[PDB]
């Protein structure tokens, strides 16, 4: 059993939280282009046969409540769980429309001992958010652990900004959807994400009238506590 069982009746839920407009208390910019991301993800995971639920502009209270409620559903007939977070962020932190919440508080509901119908099933958290404010200048070329079976697909390295394009969407979500579309019927998930890493690292470079933000680079970060290989196809 080197591969997760992915032939349950349902692939599972894909929760997309798309935070675009932020309250003035938190003081934050609108995240132009994130609607492109949310739509790309909806279509991408629809074609992978996930039950997609799009949510927009949730407060941090609403994020925690949504995650609590979803973790209390019966996932028995579901192979996996996916949550995509599109928002501003800091290291370990995602922003509701009205302020920060620790990622650990969101993901804890899905721990092996707290969401029993997902125990032993892959729980994927895909995070398009800053992890800090560094820029990458680039260079010219039998129990199981309660924390097991999580994958965090971070858009950027710890400590760094994550780049978004107001017309095309974020670099990471653009590349993620493109690689899932091309390779989900061929490659194991870590190899898909490695191609995402390559695509973001090599094909994207910032263009800015402000020299301090110009010609910058990005590498995503795959954080796997999975115990098996993950294939989105069957047979």
């Amino acid at each position: 059993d080197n591969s997760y069982k992915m032939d349950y009746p349902e692939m599972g839920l894909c929760i997309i939280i798309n935070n675009k407009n932020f309250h003035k208390s938190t003081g934050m910019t609108s995240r132009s282009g994130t609607d492109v991301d949310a739509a790309n993800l909806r279509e991408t995971f629809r074609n992978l046969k996930y039950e997609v639920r799009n949510k927009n502009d949730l407060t941090r209270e609403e994020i925690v409540e949504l995650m609590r409620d979803v973790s209390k559903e019966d996932h028995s007939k579901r192979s996996s769980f996916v949550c995509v977070l599109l928002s501003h962020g800091e290291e370990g932190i995602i922003f509701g429309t009205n302020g920060p919440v620790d990622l650990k508080k969101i993901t804890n509901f899905f721990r092996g001992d707290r969401c029993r119908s997902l125990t032993g099933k892959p729980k994927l958290f895909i995070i398009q958010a800053c992890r800090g404010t560094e820029l990458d200048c680039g260079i010219e070329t039998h129990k199981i652990p309660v924390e097991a079976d999580f994958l965090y697909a971070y858009s950027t390295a710890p400590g760094y900004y994550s780049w978004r394009n107001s017309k095309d969407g974020s670099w990471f979500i653009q590349s993620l959807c493109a690689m899932l579309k091309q390779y989900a019927d061929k490659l194991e998930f870590m190899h898909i994400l490695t191609r995402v890493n390559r695509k973001v690292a090599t094909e994207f470079e910032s263009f800015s009238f402000d020299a301090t933000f110009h010609a910058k680079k990005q590498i995503p970060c795959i954080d796997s506590m999975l115990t098996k290989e993950l294939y989105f196809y069957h047979l």
């Binding site: 910019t29 995240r31 132009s32 282009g33 994130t34 501003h88 962020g89 398009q128 958010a129 800053c130 900004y161 994550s162 780049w163 978004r164 394009n165 107001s166 974020s170 910032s206 263009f207 800015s208 933000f213």
Partner: peptide, 4 residues
């Protein structure tokens, strides 16, 4: 391009 913008940061997020």
């Amino acid at each position: 391009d913008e940061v997020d």
